[PDB]
Ligand binder design. Structure first.
Ligand code: ATP
Ligand code: CA
Ligand code: CA
Length: 362
């Protein structure tokens, strides 16, 4: 048969490729822009922020604007991948607990706007579990605009226990800007957010112990690293390195009341049947770009261990490529001989309409 396409749309980044590959073929920004061609998507839209009025179709993980998304998909198919959708089964990914209505429009749009011969909508968190080699376990997926702790058992996500923490890599990028500014630098523009995001990605890490790290940085220079601007200037970053991602465990640094990611994972586990919690503790999988900070795994271990019973075996799984675990899970799933029957065919759609996405998905 032909090649299945795996499209993973995020709040900040869109990843797309072909099932069978172990990495997406294309990855671009999830922003669209129209004058203030006729529309612009990705980097090209970002380089005209001035002349175009930009939009962000995916917000906190949920498609907020459809014609915007329809355009991102058009971009994916014809520009990035260069394939005719009507010639490839497409596998989409959606955020946990995304409304039943969005699920139907995704289906409807794929069959009536792009003429896909088949398609399927899968839950992101679950695709990551599949990618780690498990069917049972709790996932902490943290992207650029939203975090979710998702308990899964025997391949099914547990809807009543899924939690949402609106604190991801974006908040972290702005926070790093704020603290480097207070430090004496000045990072406030959109072009600079782009620079600080890179800083955050190459120099930041999670301290095993906040205070001790802070104490070493106040009395020593050992934790400092240098970063060079395209313009040539070298700037140093010390405690901002760990102080930035610490906001994941302590949202109050950002004036947020929500509890940390470690505590949110623990709260999701407890909303579960006491008979499967051990399976979750021993199978806590880290997913998403925000979970890439050096030292986050050891930290999560220590924080969970302290929140859970002393007789509890805790194990944090952090795949080296978790930045794309979601997409790889879709590449892995759409390849399975047993998943071929899950696809929603054009035929199945015509006869049963959009409401069939609940019957074949989920
Ligand atoms: N090495 C890294 N260290 C820390 N953060 C990183 C790293 N690499 C990428 N990120 C951050 O990961 C975020 C993007 O991750 P991802 O693409 O998984 O999320 P998304 O799908 O775009 O959005 P979301 O899943 O929350 O709706 C960005 O904030 C990016 O800066
Ligand atoms: Ca995502
Ligand atoms: Ca707090």
């Amino acid at each position: 048969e032909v090649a299945a396409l795996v499209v993973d749309n995020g709040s900040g980044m869109c990843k797309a490729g072909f099932a069978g590959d172990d990495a997406p073929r294309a990855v671009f920004p999830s922003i669209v822009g129209r004058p203030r061609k006729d529309s612009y998507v990705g980097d090209e839209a970002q380089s005209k922020r001035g002349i175009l009025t930009l939009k962000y179709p995916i917000e906190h993980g949920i498609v907020t604007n459809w014609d915007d998304m329809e355009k991102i998909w058009h971009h994916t198919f014809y520009n990035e991948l260069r394939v005719a959708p009507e010639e490839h089964p497409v596998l989409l990914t959606e955020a946990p607990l995304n409304p039943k209505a969005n699920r139907e429009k995704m289906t409807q749009i794929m069959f009536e706007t792009f003429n896909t011969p088949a398609m399927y909508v899968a839950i992101q968190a679950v695709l990551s579990l599949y990618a780690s080699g498990r069917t049972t376990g709790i996932v902490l997926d943290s992207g650029d605009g939203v975090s979710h702790t998702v308990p899964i058992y025997e391949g099914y996500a547990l809807p009543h226990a899924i939690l949402r923490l609106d604190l991801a890599g974006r908040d972290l990028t702005d926070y790093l800007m704020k603290i480097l500014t207070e430090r004496g630098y000045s990072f406030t523009t959109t072009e600079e957010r782009e620079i600080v995001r890179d800083i955050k990605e190459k120099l930041c890490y999670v301290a095993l112990d906040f205070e001790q790290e802070m104490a070493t940085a106040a009395s020593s220079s050992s934790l400092e690293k240098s970063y060079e601007l395209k313009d040539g200037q070298v700037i140093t970053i010390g405690n901002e390195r760990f102080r930035c991602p610490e906001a994941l465990f302590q949202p109050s640094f950002l004036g947020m009341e929500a509890c940390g990611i470690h505590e949110t994972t623990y709260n999701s586990i407890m909303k579960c049947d006491v008979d499967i919690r051990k399976d979750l503790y021993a199978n806590t999988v880290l997913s998403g770009g925000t979970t890439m900070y050096p030292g986050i795994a050891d930290r999560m271990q220590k924080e969970i261990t302290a929140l859970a019973p002393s007789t509890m075996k805790i194990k944090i799984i952090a795949p080296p490529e978790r930045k794309y675990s979601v997409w790889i899970g879709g590449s892995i799933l759409a390849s399975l001989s047993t998943f071929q029957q899950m696809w929603i065919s054009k035929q199945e759609y015509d006869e049963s309409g959009p409401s069939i996405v609940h019957r074949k998905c989920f």
